[PDB]
Structure 1
Amino acid sequence: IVCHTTATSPISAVTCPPGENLCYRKMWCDAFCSSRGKVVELGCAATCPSKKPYEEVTCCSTDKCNPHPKQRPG
């Protein structure tokens, strides 16, 4: 899983020994809904279900794909 790997990497294209067949972008709050930050956990993942803890998850396969920030259309 060579994407935005934070498994001992600063958002770096590393094939993570911790995790499974998905690339993360596990993002939520967004002011960390208090005193300003963007909680993006970059977790090498098995599946992104429909019935999830409702966060904006760009659950990609591999090859960079899914970066930290708000994946917002220009």
Structure 2
Amino acid sequence: TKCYVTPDATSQTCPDGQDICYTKTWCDGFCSSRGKRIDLGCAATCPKVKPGVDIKCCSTDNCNPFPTWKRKH
């Protein structure tokens, strides 16, 4: 199982692997720093090419609480 964001339910799905939680976005800090951002997936590698979008990956499962919201949470 894994994480995600989509704050609605909890946010630990896409079993498949094995893999990671990846969240990639746009902004992170002041633009919309209280929704969201973020598209996420069931990973497949966080490399190191990024312009301006915030990309985080972490192996594990659920990684992730960090639903964060507004502030947490």
Structure with the higher fraction of residues in strand conformation: 2
Count of residue pairs the alignment pairs up:
66
TM-score using structure 2 length: 0.52
CA contact (8 A) 2:18 2:61 kept: no
In structure 2, the gaps of 5 or more residues are: none
Aligned Cα RMSD in Å? 3.7
Structure 1 ranges of 4+ moved more than 3 A: none
Give the match for residue 61 of structure 1.
59
Amino acid at match of 2:22: Y
TM-score using structure 1 length: 0.52
CA contact (8 A) 1:21 1:61 kept: yes
Equivalent-residue separation in structure 1 for 2:25 and 2:41 (angstroms): 10
Percent of pairs identical after alignment?
43
Structure with the higher fraction of residues in helix conformation: 1
Equivalent-residue separation in structure 1 for 2:68 and 2:19 (angstroms): 21
Distance 1:53 1:16, change over 3 A: farther
